[PDB]
Amino acid sequence: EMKRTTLDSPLGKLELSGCEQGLHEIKLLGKDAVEVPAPAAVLGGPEPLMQCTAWLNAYFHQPEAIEEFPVPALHHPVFQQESFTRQVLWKLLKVVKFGEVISYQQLAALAGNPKAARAVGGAMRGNPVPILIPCHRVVCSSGAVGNYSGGLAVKEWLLAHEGHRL
To answer: What EC designation does it have?
Structure first.
């Protein structure tokens, strides 16, 4: 049921996986890159996969129109059961737009528990679909960018790409 394909990007090769029920995971394989827009190794596939490739292409190469591309349905165990992690990931996906940032504290409050900023930071580690669900937009209230599953360099690259003065 699970299908996979790869896609070159400014952050290196990306491995995409999913099925008819939804996108399962977006994995960063090499942190090398390329600035020239590239197509997926294997075209077509489950609808969620095609929507993901279209979304990522727009994110990197036609950002001015990113809000116009639909986020595919997601199919991963983290989204199949109720948990604080799911609450946090879904709120992040729904609320934070391109170019905007939110603090660990603000996201915790949005998720119903203002004192759980540490757990929010921990929840970011469980995001199976980076970039798409913008965990890179969750930063420190001090102004510091904060930790990132893909490394500080990549988080800074993404934030700079979105207009921040970094």
So the answer is: 2.1.1.63
Method of structure determination = X-ray
d(CA 91, CA 38): 31
Give the annotated binding-site residues for Zn(2+).
19, 24, 75
Strand partners, 139: 103
Asked if residues 43 and 7 have their Cβ atoms less than 8 Å apart, the reply is no
Q: What is the resolution of this structure in A?
A: 1.9
Check if the beta carbon of residue 23 is closer than 8 Å to that of residue 48.
yes
Q: Please say if 135 is a catalytic residue.
A: yes
Say which CATH number the domain at 95 has: 1.10.10.10
Asked if 35 and 112 sit in the same domain, the reply is no
Q: Are residues 38 and 49 in the same domain?
A: yes
**Binding site residue list for DNA:** 85, 104-105, 113, 118, 141
